[PDB]
Every structure is written in structure tokens, then in C-alpha cells.
Amino acid sequence: GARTWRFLTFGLALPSVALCTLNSWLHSGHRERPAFIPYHHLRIRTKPFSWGDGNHTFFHNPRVNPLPTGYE
Amino acid sequence: FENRVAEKQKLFQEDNGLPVHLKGGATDNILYRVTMTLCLGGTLYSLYCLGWASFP
Amino acid sequence: YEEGPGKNIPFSVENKWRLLAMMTLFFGSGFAAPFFIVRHQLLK
Amino acid sequence: YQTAPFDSRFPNQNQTRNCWQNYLDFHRCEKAMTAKGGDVSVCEWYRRVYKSLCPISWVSTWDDRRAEGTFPGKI
Amino acid sequence: ITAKPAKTPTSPKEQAIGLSVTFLSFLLPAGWVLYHLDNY
Amino acid sequence: MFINRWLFSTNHKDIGTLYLLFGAWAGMVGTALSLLIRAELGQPGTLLGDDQIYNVVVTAHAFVMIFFMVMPIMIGGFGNWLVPLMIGAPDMAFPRMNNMSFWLLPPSFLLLLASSMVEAGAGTGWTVYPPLAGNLAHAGASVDLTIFSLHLAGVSSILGAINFITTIINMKPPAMSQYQTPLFVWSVMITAVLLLLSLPVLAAGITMLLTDRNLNTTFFDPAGGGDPILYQHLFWFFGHPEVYILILPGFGMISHIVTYYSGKKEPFGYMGMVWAMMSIGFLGFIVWAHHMFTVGMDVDTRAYFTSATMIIAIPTGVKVFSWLATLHGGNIKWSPAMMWALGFIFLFTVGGLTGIVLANSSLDIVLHDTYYVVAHFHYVLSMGAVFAIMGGFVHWFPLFSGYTLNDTWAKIHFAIMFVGVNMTFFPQHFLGLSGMPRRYSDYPDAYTMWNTISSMGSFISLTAVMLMVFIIWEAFASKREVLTVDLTTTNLEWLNGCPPPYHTFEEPTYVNL
Amino acid sequence: QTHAYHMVNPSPWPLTGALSALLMTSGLTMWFHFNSMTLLMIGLTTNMLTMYQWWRDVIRESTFQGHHTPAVQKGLRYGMILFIISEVLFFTGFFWAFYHSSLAPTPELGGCWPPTGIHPLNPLEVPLLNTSVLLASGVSITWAHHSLMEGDRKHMLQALFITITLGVYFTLLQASEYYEAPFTISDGVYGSTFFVATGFHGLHVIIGSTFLIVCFFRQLKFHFTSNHHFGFEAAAWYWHFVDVVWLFLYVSIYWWGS
Amino acid sequence: GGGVPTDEEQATGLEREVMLAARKGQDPYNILAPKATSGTKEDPNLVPSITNKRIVGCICEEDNSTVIWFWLHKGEAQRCPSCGTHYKLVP
Amino acid sequence: MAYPMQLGFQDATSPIMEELLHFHDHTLMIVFLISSLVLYIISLMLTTKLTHTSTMDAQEVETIWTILPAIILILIALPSLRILYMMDEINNPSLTVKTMGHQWYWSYEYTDYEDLSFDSYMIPTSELKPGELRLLEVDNRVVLPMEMTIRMLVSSEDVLHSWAVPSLGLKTDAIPGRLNQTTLMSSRPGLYYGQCSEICGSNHSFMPIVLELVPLKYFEKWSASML
Ligand code: HEA
Ligand code: HEA
Ligand SMILES: CCCCC/C=C\C/C=C/C/C=C\C/C=C\CCCC(=O)O[C@H](COC(=O)CCCCCCCCCCCCCCCCC)COP(=O)(O)OCCN
Ligand SMILES: CCCCCC/C=C\CCCCCCCCCC(=O)O[C@H](COC(=O)CCCCCCCCCCCCCCC)COP(=O)(O)OC[C@@H](O)CO
Ligand SMILES: CCCCCC/C=C\CCCCCCCCCC(=O)O[C@H](COC(=O)CCCCCCCCCCCCCCC)COP(=O)(O)OC[C@@H](O)CO
Ligand SMILES: CCCCCCCCCCO[C@@H]1O[C@H](CO)[C@@H](O[C@H]2O[C@H](CO)[C@@H](O)[C@H](O)[C@H]2O)[C@H](O)[C@H]1O
Ligand SMILES: CCCCCCCCCCO[C@@H]1O[C@H](CO)[C@@H](O[C@H]2O[C@H](CO)[C@@H](O)[C@H](O)[C@H]2O)[C@H](O)[C@H]1O
Ligand SMILES: CCCCCCCCCCO[C@@H]1O[C@H](CO)[C@@H](O[C@H]2O[C@H](CO)[C@@H](O)[C@H](O)[C@H]2O)[C@H](O)[C@H]1O
Ligand SMILES: C[C@H](CCC(=O)O)[C@H]1CC[C@H]2[C@@H]3[C@H](O)C[C@@H]4C[C@H](O)CC[C@]4(C)[C@H]3C[C@H](O)[C@]12C
Ligand code: CUA
Ligand code: NA
Ligand SMILES: [Zn+2]
């Protein structure tokens, strides 16, 4: 019945989301970025990207995404 | 809100010979003409772009 | 819509010589295209 | 020594990991020996096997990456 | 199958024209390209 | 009226007609490409240029023959025309989505012809293997245009598969079980299931190739930890089912043609024929790596793929023997369509048997990437799929058009095409055994005689294709209107006359339990 | 006619859809190679116009004109099931790519998974929250379904609104995790498999959320009866498909692949 | 808590016609397989039509894969050309 | 190498190639027989005015139609898989040689003892010496010892290639980032030819393989002279 699935929605499902939201909130905060090492299997560039200067990924984050030449 | 489905059933069953994509009235014709103009015009532009890209 | 022989097709068969012309252009353009593509690639 | 013998760890047509493992084993051994100041001659078997199996350009690329600090294997 | 006689009969002469025009529509354009390959 | 009818169709027959016109045009392109191949190889030396222009022609030949000629004619053309009529249905389940399956193909074809016109073309083979198909060895737009062509052809066929499965399951007379539908209808339902499952995997693989080429992914690039051989697995997971997709509707048409021209009410061993097609469809998903016997896989893997591939001969044999058993005791009518079907049974058998030779991984070491493979697949495609298409076309042309062909001309056409295809492909066995590689613009001098004869064969096939255009013209030119058709009691598609009205089965059939 | 099946009015949308496909593909070509977005933006616009008018007409034919007999509805059920199967096989290709790369990591990676220099996300942080969100949305959409069958307009709307809100939450969480991720699509086969597989999944979540929002407005306008609501069933099946793909991604890429 | 329309309130067009006919045990849109009579000339299978002819498919014996198709015309009962079962049109 | 008007395989140079010839003869007899039987049966079905058009019972005959083909496939599979596993057997090679495919030539590396490597390019048609074979000769042949088990390792430094020598029964794909192994044993001295067997771009037709098989003592002196 609808009554039972509403009971599960409010009694189990959304409490689970609230608990995992709390869990994520507590373990949030910027972890320290690692030493840049120019590994050849990472920061692949076989063709410039079709946006920006060709060298920045689509959701480039200056804080944690180094360029082939290192952090900006 | 109120249930106005009966009034839309009357409009879409009116015996006027219109196909279903034009049967809502003048706005359907406009949105049809915009769609078909962008498609046919875009297709001509894609052909021009092939012409251009076919030579160095 | 028209029904019956010669009416259930997007091309006319009313005149066999106009039809020969249309079929010539249709099949001929398909067969010619690769030769003209090779010509295009050779002429670059 | 003629060539690298059959190795039951790598019995199939794909010999990539055989070259790789012997290259790692040689450089791990050489590091262990140079560190305590022991003798790299104990590492000789790994050297002969990787030189036999590994393409010259793979060894050359791996050597360049060890010198650069970009070699991704654990030595 | 049975069928009526032709509503617009195609005489041997008319067939020779249709067959000739059909073959030429395939052969002349390809022939022109292959003849001129050296020029390309 | 013309636009509403031919650009805005929701009618299974008119959409079928659009597919047959599209496929016929595609067949002329594919034929021209085949003649450029054989012109290059017809004497030792270089005719056109190096392997790039040559492999652009070879690659386009395959894509045009497979995606724009065979699939549109068998599935889009015969399937749309015949399936609703054979189950008494008033149209397809999704008659407007049906029209989009058709209209995706001209743009798909345009993207393929654009690939060949820009830069130096896609000289990759129809398999499009990286790294040759990657952004270093094939820099520029050609391979991306090929990928997008395949994406549109893939969507066309996926939506078409959803349409056929739904129509065949949901729109039969309520008394008719699946075991009372004609074999052609079974052949289209099974082909549609193969398309539904296989094309999405191709879509995933060519999408990965697209992102390796344009978004700096490395699915197939060892520098990023990728593997060129992963592409091969994804491609062939599709590519083996694809060849069963190309033949299954041909098997269905052959069952109908052999039954009809034997004067029989029914094919021999109906349930065996259904079993055989479902078995072939299933086995066709578990054999793909017989395309990869030289890539370096483990011996036990090669043993499994050898064995699983050979199993397909059992259900396939049941179909061949069932066709022979349909002929047995027939009142044989030596129609042109019967000649196509009899050539099919024999020539398909020969190409199936050379497939069984290739299934042996040990022997495939020496035959792989040689003309022996080319001989195998042209026996099953250029003498199997094509013979079924020509048989179906001459058998059902009067249904579709309301006019008859000249049977004498159609028999002449059969005789020329039979000589041409055998002269083209039989000698390629010798070239393969003696080691001539695939995708070569030129060959060591020893291979000259068989390449010369093969090229002469291809010109005989060209003469057949030109004559076929004339034969279709002569039928429309003369206008011999159909009067009576025999065996309508076991061939429902004929019972509404020739051509059938735009709307058929407005009042459905009466079938009681 | 004395059968129950739908003879559809001649329609331009198949042709506008086919041409929108040409404009999107030739547009992507023109964006990747000739530094221009114009064709692509025309193709995306005509694709959206086509989808809008086509599905509008399906609502006209069904809710307003009565063409969806039980036989037509049964056909649409099969159509949507077959469509979902095809989408399952599409994702299978990306899962195959992922397992191929991760089970036999090549020397370029360091011969290990995850590769040297890759710092995976913690699967117990936002990825676990995302799991809770999509599972919760599977519960709320079931509540919405039962409310509709029981004739309860207000509870159907509340449950469906909750389902859409969770779909939006998942999408905003994934956008933020994309931005925060220390690895990119260009970080070898790890970045390739991660972003393409989770990216197609994200696109399917946006499509599914859009479908649910279409159902929400149709419900506001009283289109659905307590017995006839195939658009809602189809959106719910699609939404369960999106949930199940997520569970496979979570176990495979986020957890087992960390 | 109500506010959702029923099919009885809101179904229209052919959907509504099918709905209302099924309540009356009637099948004008051919959703059900008709049940055979003994099929003798005295007790022919009665084939409804809105015109003067309709296609019959005869599954002559249970589990035959072969269906026998023919036009049934208004007038005297006709027979399946395979099994001789009688059918009569009722326009 | 192949010779004009050749119908079958190049003569076997290795024991495994001999095995493949006898396996092909067995398989081809079966192909000939089945092809012949089908053509004969077609012709028998089509050559009588006698008729039988009533429903025919299928089950008895379908037993024959399935069992006989299953037996024939087992008769192919048994020797097929014996040969597959024989090629895979452990042999103890005396020598390892690497080949790297390139656009458009082969490089060879003999690095068991010294750093010996060289490039191997097709002899252009205009530079053939009288008696030499168009598209098949190379400048630098792959000299190898006869009557010895050799491990050949195959890779690429660019696109796919495939390293083939038909008379030895050899074909190994050349895949960048992968080292594929095969074994080579020539029963005879001589010159053994092959051709690149994976489409690799503009000069795919023009990057052949020439093995030169000689006594060990000659191979050792050649090796020394190539450093
Ligand atoms: C219609 C297309 C089609 C069909 C139906 C088939 C059918 C089969 N094919 Fe083929 N094939 C291709 C098209 C097709 N093929 C193409 C295009 C390629 C190349 C792809 C590329 O690289 O571009 C190819 C390649 C290909 C390869 C790879 C070879 C290589 O690249 O090295 C192999 C390997 O096993 C294979 C085998 C088979 C087998 C076993 C069948 C079986 O299904 C055949 C079964 C039929 C019979 C056996 C005949 C009838 C049976 C009897 C009369 C019963 C008695 C028989 C026996 C007891 C044996 N084919
Ligand atoms: C359906 C598939 C199909 C068909 C029919 C053919 C037909 C032909 N093919 Fe090809 N071919 C392939 C699929 C096909 N091919 C594939 C997949 C490859 C591998 C590509 C690769 O290596 O990447 C290939 C490769 C290939 C090669 C090897 C190239 C190389 O390795 O370098 C050669 C060499 O001769 C060849 C020649 C021919 C010839 C002369 C024909 C002739 O027989 C063609 C003659 C003409 C016809 C058969 C008519 C066609 C038209 C119709 C039937 C229209 C009908 C009209 C109506 C019904 C109205 N093709
Ligand atoms: C919250 C998730 C929602 C996704 C929306 C994001 C972008 C647009 C559309 C996405 C569609 C999904 C998959 C397409 C492929 C790649 C995108 C993967 C997901 C994504 O968005 O990946 C991003 C890269 O995007 C890039 O390159 C962007 C590249 C944009 C161009 C896309 C190219 C389209 C590919 C063609 C599609 C083919 C479809 C096949 C149809 C099959 C028919 C049979 C990751 O960012 P990053 O900066 O690298 O790393 C994060 C670092 N902080
Ligand atoms: C690089 C970019 C390349 C991308 C190419 C894009 C290709 C084409 C552009 C797409 C334009 C889409 C326009 C909307 C189409 C809606 C189809 C639809 O909804 O079709 C329905 C049937 O399919 C059903 O149900 C169930 C099936 C619904 C399918 C919806 C459309 C899918 C489009 C892409 C699918 C690819 C598959 C992904 C897996 C690989 C309805 O059938 P109709 O015959 O209309 O009506 C029947 C009447 O009785 C209804 O009252
Ligand atoms: C930003 C992203 C851009 C990419 C484009 C995709 C974006 C958004 C698309 C969202 C999908 C919305 C679909 C809306 C369909 C509304 C029409 C509808 O739902 O129609 C219903 C029928 O279902 C039907 O056709 C079922 C029709 C089902 C279609 C579902 C399609 C899923 C689409 C996927 C398309 C592309 C995916 C490819 C990804 C690679 C009508 O019948 P009922 O509901 O019973 O009503 C009748 C009752 O009132 C009678 O009492
Ligand atoms: C209704 C039917 C459909 C309407 C069709 C409309 C077609 C007209 C589009 C205008 O054409 C544009 O021209 C720009 C040039 O002015 C290009 O800019 C691009 O190309 C430039 C070349 O100089 C560079 O500056 C950059 O790449 C970039 O700005 C761009 O590609 C191109 O689209
Ligand atoms: C694979 C498919 C092709 C198969 C072979 C085609 C058969 C040939 C058909 C004839 O084609 C023509 O041949 C002429 C020569 O015979 C060419 O004229 C060329 O040669 C003439 C004689 O030298 C000159 O007068 C002309 O100006 C000159 O264009 C002409 O252009 C070309 O159309
Ligand atoms: C209904 C039809 C009527 C309207 C016709 C359509 C008119 C559209 C013309 C706009 O052209 C655009 O110009 C931008 C700027 O010139 C380009 O950005 C390009 O250049 C930018 C920098 O200038 C870069 O940032 C981008 O990455 C890059 O794609 C963009 O591609 C291109 O589409
Ligand atoms: C007042 C109105 C009545 C709708 C009606 O019966 O016509 C109610 C019924 C259910 C309501 C919706 C649901 O309660 C869920 C949402 C609750 C939020 O607090 C507001 C928006 C929200 C999306 C509501 C908007 C609106 O007030 C709705 C649609
Ligand atoms: Cu190297 Cu082909
Ligand atoms: Na040549
Ligand atoms: Zn009967």
C-alpha cells in the first residue's frame, strides 16, 4: 500500500540520507594535495581540448588538478 | 488546480481534419515552422561546412 | 492518397523515357560518386 | 647462459609481465646491494633475463623515467 | 503468376535504347575518371 | 501531399519502399567501390596511390555494403513490407518511430561520404582498430565522421529492433501463437534481438575510440594503461552477431522462396527451423574471439573459441537439409527467384564450410589476415546475403509494385551474376592458402594470375548490376499488371492483391481456437 | 478500423529528429576539429524541439484523443523494456572496459590498481551519500506509484516531488565531486573509466529526472488515472534502471576499484 | 485523500469504446480469439464483418504451425480448403 | 615464398607447418565431401516429375541431420586441438630474438649477449638486383640458426602490425605495449619470406620479412660482424 511505502520513505530511506549527509559533512574539508610528479600515464595530452587554452580539463580545479607542467 | 482534461479532449477530437501536431492551433504552426526552418537551414549549413572541410 | 500500380512510389512511371532519365540519374549518381571521391583525393 | 628459460609464472603468448618483473627484480636487487654496499653481481640473473626479453625502447624509457623520478613501479 | 499484357509495350528497339542508356550512365562517368587518372 | 506521404510517413509499406530505394542506391556505391578495389589489384603495380587511398576504398566498400545495402534492404525493406502483412497487422507498433529509423540513414551515409572527402579519408578497415584509427596515425576529422556515421546507423537499427520485436510479439491475431508465425517473421524477430544486444556494445566501443581521439582518454592507449586489444573485444562482441544479423533474414526469405517454388504449403521441419535460428542467434554471442586468434590470447581460450565456433554448423546444417527436404517431392517451378535460392543453398554451404576451416585456431594462424578469409565471407555475403536479397526482390517485386518482371531477362541476370561472383571469389582461396595478405594495394608477382582472374570476375558482376537496373526499368516501362498469384492460402502477404491498399487489415483476420 | 491499434497521423518529427542527429554529430565534428560550436548548438536546439513536440503529440493521442487501448499500452510496455535492455548493454561495454583495465594493470600504471599517482575518492564519503540518495528515491517513487493507484493526488505529488529532489541532490553532489576530484578524464585509464562510466550515468540521471518532472506536471494537470499512467510507469522503470546502474558503479569503480 | 480521475470518468475515444464494450461482454475491436463451433454446414463458424468479405485463418488442427488463409464472402458458408471446416460471414 | 599459379600452402619449413598441411588435407576432404553431397542432393531433388506435397514427418531424419554433423565436427576438433596444444608445449629455446613493427619496416633485436639491433626495409623495385623478388626482398635479413628452437618476441612502437612467415606456420600480431611470443624452428637452411599482416597505413603492402637460415657457426660470425 501507499501507507507502507510512505512509512519506508520517512522511517528508513530519508533517515538514511540524513545520517549519510551528517557522515559526509563531518569528513568534509580540503585534504592536503600531494607532491606533483610528472608521471607519463597521467595528465595525458594527445590532442588539445576543444575549450579554453586546450590544456585545462573541463572541471579543472586549480587547487587539486596539476597541468602536465605542475600546479598553476 | 482544476481538472481541464475534458476541455482538451474536446479540442483534440474536433472534426477539422488537422493532424495531431497542428491541432492545438496557431502556436503549433509557429513551433513547427521554427523547427523545420532550423533543421533545413542547419542541414544546408552542415553541407557548406563539408564543402569547406573537403579542401585544405 | 493514390493507390494501385505506379501510384505507391515516390517517383512517376507515367512516361517510360522520363523514368529512364530519373533512374539513370539515381543509380548513375550512386555508381559515379566513388570515382569522383577518388578523383578529389588524387587532386589534393 | 644462452637465453631466458621457460618461467612457469609466464607460460602464455603474452610475455609483457615477464620482461617487466625481471626489470623490477634487477633494479630492486641493485638497490638492496648498493645500499648495504654489497655486490650487484648477485643481481646478474635478473639483468641477463630482462636484457634478453625486453625491447630496447622499453628498457631505455624505463631507465629515463627512473632518472626523472617518474617510474611508476616500486623499486 | 498470371498478368495482363503490357499496358505500354516496350519493343525490342525501345529495350535496346533503355539498355544502352542504362549501361552508358554507369560506364561514361567512371570511364572519364579512370581515363584521366594520370592527369590527377 | 507528396511531402506528407514520403517525408512524414507512418505507413509500413511506404517506409519499406523508402528502405528498398535507399538500399539499391547504396548497392551502386558499394559496387563502384568493389570495382576500384579490383581495378587496383587487376594487374601488378600501383593504379590509384598507396595503401591509404586503397584502404579508404576498402573500408567504405564494407561499410556501404553492410550498413547501407544489406541491413536496410533485408530489415528495413523486406521486414517493413512483409512482417505486418504476414501477421495480419495494420502497421508496425511504432509507425512514427519507424519513419525515424529510415530518415537516420541518409545522414549516416552523408557522414560516411564526408569521412572520405575530408583530409585523407579513414583508411582503417571496417573494424576501425586503434592505434591506426587513433588521433596520431589518423589525425583529423575522417575517423570521427566514420564513428558518427556508425552512431546514427546504430540508433536507426536499435529503434528498428524495438519496433520489430514489439510488433511481432504484440500484434499477431489473438489465436496465433509464436509457433504459427511464418519463418521470415521469426528470422526478423531473432535478427532484432541480436541488434538490440550487440549494437549498444559497438556504441560503447566506438564512443571510447571517440573520447581517446578528442577528450584525452586512454581506453586503447598503453601510455595511459589502455589496451588496443580491448577495442577488438568490444568491436567483435558486436561484429560476430552482426554477420548473423546479415544472414538471418536471408535464411527466412530462402525458407519462403524454396517452399513457394516447390509448390509446398509449408517448409520441412518448421520447429527445427525455429530451433536452428534461435540456436544460431545464441551461439553467435559466445564465439567473437575467433576474430582474434593471432593477438596472443591463452591456449585454453583459443581451444574454447575453436570448439564453440564449430558448434554453429549443427543448427545451420539442420536448415540446409530442411531446405533440401522442402524441395523433395516438389512441383518445382524454375522461376528466377528459385534459381537465386538454389544458388544460395549451395554457395552459402561452401562459405559456411570455409568458415569451419577458419574456426580451427591452429590453421587460422596461417589463414588469418589472408584472402582465405576474404573468400569465406564473400561466399556467405556476396553469394549468400546477396542471393537471398535478389531472390526476395524478384519474388516480391510484383507484390510491391503490381507489375511483373521479364522472367527471361531475370534468368539472364542470374546466369551473369553467378559466373561473375564465382570467377571473382573462387580463386581468392588459392591466394589465401599461398599467403596473400588482406588490405594490400599490390602483391608479389607470384599472385598475379589469380588476382587477374578475380578482377575479370568483378567486371562480369558489374555487367549483372547494370542489367538489373535495365530489368527494373523494363518492368515499370511495360506495365504488365498482376492478375493471379498461386498458393495465397499459405502466403498471406499476397492475399490483399498487388500492390496491396495503403491500409490493409483495417478489419483484422478471423482466426478461432 | 475494427482492431485496437493506433494508426498515427503523418508526422514531421521523425525527419526533424533525424536531421537533429546530423546537426549534433556534424556539430561535434566542427567543435573537435574546426573550433566552432554553431552547428552543435543548432542540433541540440532542434533535438529538444523535436523531443518536446513528439512527446507532446503522444500525450495528445493518449490523454486527449483516447488512442491508447490496452493493446497499444502493452506495446509501449514492451518498447520501454527493450529500450532499457539496450541501455543495459551500452553500460556493459563501459563495465567491460573498467574490468579489463583494472584486473590486468599494465606496466605504465606501475602494474597495480589503482595506478601509481591516483588517489581515489573515499567510497564511504560522498559516494555512499549518493548511494543512500538514489536508494531513497527508489523508495519514494514506489510510494508515488501506490498513491496514484490508490487515487491519492496529494500524496502522489509529494512522493514524486521527493523523488525529483533526491535526483537533483545526486546530480549536485556528483557535480561537486567532479570539481573536487584530484584526478581528471586525462589521468590515464583510471580517469577514462571513472569519468566516462559515471558521466554517462550522470546524463541518465538528468534524463530520468527530466522524465519524472514531465510526469510531475502531467499529474498537476490531472492527465493520469488511477489505472492508466504508462508515462509514470516508464519513468519509474527508467529510474530503477538508473539506481541499479549506480549500485554496479559504486561496487565496481568506487569500492572494489579503490 | 482523492483527486485522481478514474478511467470511468476520463477515458475517451477508442480506449473508452473498448472499456464500455468489455463491460457488456462485447468485442467490436477483435481483442479476443473467437471460440470455434463444430464447423459443420449446420453449425458453421460465424465470422462477424463490417463489410461483405473478411480474411479467415484456419488452424486446422491444434498446434499446426501452418495457417490456411482465405477470403470469406457474404452468402453461402465456405469451407477451409485444407480441412473443410465451415465458415459463414455475418456482416 | 609463393610461386606462380600456386593452389595450396607454401611447402612446410617447420614440423608444425607439416602438421598444419596434414590437418588441412583432412579438413579439406570433409569440406569437398559435404559440398559435393549438398550439390548432388540439390540435383537429385530437382530431377524428377514425381511429387509428394503433403505434410512430411521431420523427427527421425533430424536425428541423422544433427548426430552425423556432430561426429564430423569431433573428427575435425580432435586433431585441431592436438596441434593447438603441440604449438603451446614447453620447448627450451637456445636463442631469443625480438622484432618491433614500425611504419613501415621491421627492427630486430638480438640481446641475449651483445646489443645487436638493426632495421629491415623493403628493397625498392628500382633497386632490385637481377633475380630478386618485387616487394619481398629486404636490405637486412633476419639471420637465424637452422635446426634450433628460437623464441621470437613481437611488439610495435606505433600502430598494429603482424609478423608472418607462412612456410614456418607463423603469424603473431605486433601490438604496442605488449610482448607476444612464438617459437620458430627451421628444418632447413634457406630464405623464408613473409609480409606485414595487419593494416598499418600507407605502406602496409611494403614492409616484408626475410629469414636467412644458416648453420650456428655462420650465425655466430654474422652476429659478431653486425655489432
Ligand atoms: C553473412 C556473413 C557471415 C556468416 C553467416 C559467417 C559464418 C561463419 N563464419 Fe565468418 N566471417 C564473415 C562473415 C560471415 N561468416 C566476415 C565478414 C568475416 C571477416 C570479418 C573481418 O575480419 O572483416 C568472417 C570471418 C570469420 C572468421 C575469422 C577468420 C580470420 O579473420 O582469421 C571465422 C573463424 O572461425 C569465421 C567462421 C564462420 C563460421 C564457422 C560460420 C558458420 O556460421 C558457418 C556455418 C555453416 C556451415 C558449416 C554450412 C552448412 C552446414 C552443413 C551443410 C552441415 C554440415 C557441416 C559440417 C559437419 C561442418 N568467419
Ligand atoms: C554485404 C557485404 C559485401 C558484399 C556484397 C561485397 C561484395 C564484393 N566485394 Fe567485398 N568486402 C566486404 C563486404 C562485401 N563485399 C567486407 C566486409 C570486406 C572487408 C573490408 C575490410 O577489410 O576492412 C570486403 C573486402 C573486399 C575485398 C578485399 C580488399 C582487401 O583485403 O584489400 C575485395 C577484393 O576483391 C572485395 C571485392 C568485392 C567484390 C568484387 C564484390 C562484388 O561481388 C559486388 C558485386 C555487386 C553486387 C553484389 C550488387 C550489390 C547491389 C545490390 C544487391 C542492390 C540490389 C538492388 C535492389 C534489390 C533494388 N571486397
Ligand atoms: C554530473 C555528470 C553530468 C555530465 C555532463 C558533463 C558534460 C557534458 C555531457 C556529458 C555526457 C556524458 C559522457 C560523455 C563523455 C565524457 C564526459 C564524462 C563526464 C564528465 O563531465 O567528465 C569531465 C570531463 O568532461 C569532458 O571532458 C567533457 C566533454 C564534453 C563533450 C562530450 C562529448 C560527447 C561524446 C559523444 C556522445 C556519444 C553518444 C553515443 C550514443 C550512442 C548511440 C548508439 C570530468 O572533468 P575533469 O575536469 O576531466 O575531471 C575533474 C577534475 N576536477
Ligand atoms: C553523438 C550524438 C548521436 C545521437 C544520435 C541521436 C539520434 C536521434 C535523435 C533523437 C530524437 C528523438 C526524438 C524523440 C523520439 C521518441 C520516440 C518514441 O517515444 O517512440 C515511442 C515508441 O518507442 C518506445 O516506446 C520506447 C523507445 C523510446 C526511445 C526514445 C529515443 C531514443 C534516442 C537515442 C537512443 C540510443 C540508444 C542508447 C543505447 C545505445 C512511440 O512510438 P511512435 O511511433 O511515435 O507512436 C506510437 C503511438 O501509438 C503513440 O501514441
Ligand atoms: C540534457 C540531456 C539531453 C539529452 C536528451 C534527453 C533529455 C530529456 C528526455 C527526458 C524523457 C522524457 C519523456 C517524456 C514522455 C512523455 C510522453 C508520455 O509519457 O506518453 C505516455 C506514453 O508513454 C510513452 O510514450 C513512453 C515514451 C518513453 C520515452 C523515454 C525515453 C528516455 C529517453 C532517452 C533519450 C536519450 C538517451 C540516450 C543516452 C545515450 C502517454 O501515455 P500515458 O502516460 O498512459 O497517458 C495516457 C493517460 O492519460 C490516459 O488516461
Ligand atoms: C537557421 C539556419 C541555420 C543558421 C546557420 C548559421 C551559419 C552562420 C554561422 C557563422 O559562421 C561562423 O563564422 C565564424 C567566423 O566568423 C566562425 O568562428 C570560429 O572560426 C573563426 C575563424 O576565424 C575563429 O575565430 C574561431 O575558430 C571561431 O571564432 C564559426 O565557426 C562559424 O560558425
Ligand atoms: C569500372 C567501371 C568502368 C568500366 C570501363 C568503362 C568503359 C569505358 C566507357 C567509355 O568511357 C569513356 O571513354 C572515352 C575513351 O574511350 C573517354 O574519352 C576520352 O578519350 C577520347 C579518345 O582519346 C577523347 O576523344 C575524349 O576527349 C576523352 O575524354 C571518355 O571520357 C570516357 O567517358
Ligand atoms: C538561428 C540561427 C541564427 C544565429 C546563427 C548562429 C550564430 C552563432 C555564431 C557564434 O559563433 C561562435 O563564436 C564563438 C567565439 O568566436 C566561438 O567560440 C570559440 O572561440 C572562443 C574564444 O573566442 C573559445 O573560447 C571557444 O572555446 C570556441 O569554441 C564559437 O565556437 C562559435 O559558435
Ligand atoms: C496546493 C497544491 C494543490 C495541487 C492541486 O491539488 O491542484 C499542492 C498539492 C501537493 C503540493 C506539492 C507537494 O506538497 C510537494 C512540494 C512541497 C513544497 O513545500 C512546495 C512545493 C511542492 C511541489 C507542492 C506544490 C503545491 O503546493 C502542491 C502541488
Ligand atoms: Cu605493418 Cu601492415
Ligand atoms: Na595494385
Ligand atoms: Zn482448416
Numbering used by the authors:
A (entry chain G): 12 to 83
B (entry chain J): 1 to 56
C (entry chain L): 3 to 46
D (entry chain H): 11 to 85
E (entry chain M): 1 to 40
F (entry chain A): 1 to 513
G (entry chain C): 4 to 261
H (entry chain F): 3 to 93
Verbatim from the authors:
CO2, N2O, and Xe2 were all bound to a common site (site 2) near the branching point of another hydrophobic channel that branched from the O2 channel. The electron density of CO2 or N2O at site 2 was remarkably strong and little changed in the aerobic and anaerobic conditions. The hydrophobic interactions that sandwiched the ligand between Phe67I and Phe68I may affect the stability of ligands at site 2. In addition to the hydrophobic interactions, hydrogen bonds between CO2 or N2O and the hydroxyl group of Ser108I, and between CO2 or N2O and Wat2 may stabilize the binding of CO2 and N2O. A previous study showed that incubation of the fully oxidized “fast” CcO under a CO2 atmosphere caused a 3 nm shift in the Soret spectral peak and slowed the CN− binding rate. Therefore, CO2, H2CO3, and/or HCO3− are probably bound close to the O2 reduction site. Third, when CO2 is bound to site 2, this channel is blocked, which may inhibit the O2 supply.
pmcCytochrome c oxidase (CcO), a terminal enzyme of the respiratory chain, catalyzes oxygen (O2) reduction coupled with the proton pump, generating a proton-motive force across the membrane. Mammalian CcO consists of three mitochondrial DNA–coded core subunits (subunits I, II, and III) and at least 10 nuclear DNA–coded peripheral subunits. Cytochrome c oxidase (CcO) catalyzes oxygen (O2) reduction at the heme a3–CuB site in the transmembrane region of the enzyme. It has been proposed that the hydrophobic channel that connects the transmembrane surface of subunit III through subunit I to the heme a3–CuB site is the O2 transfer pathway.
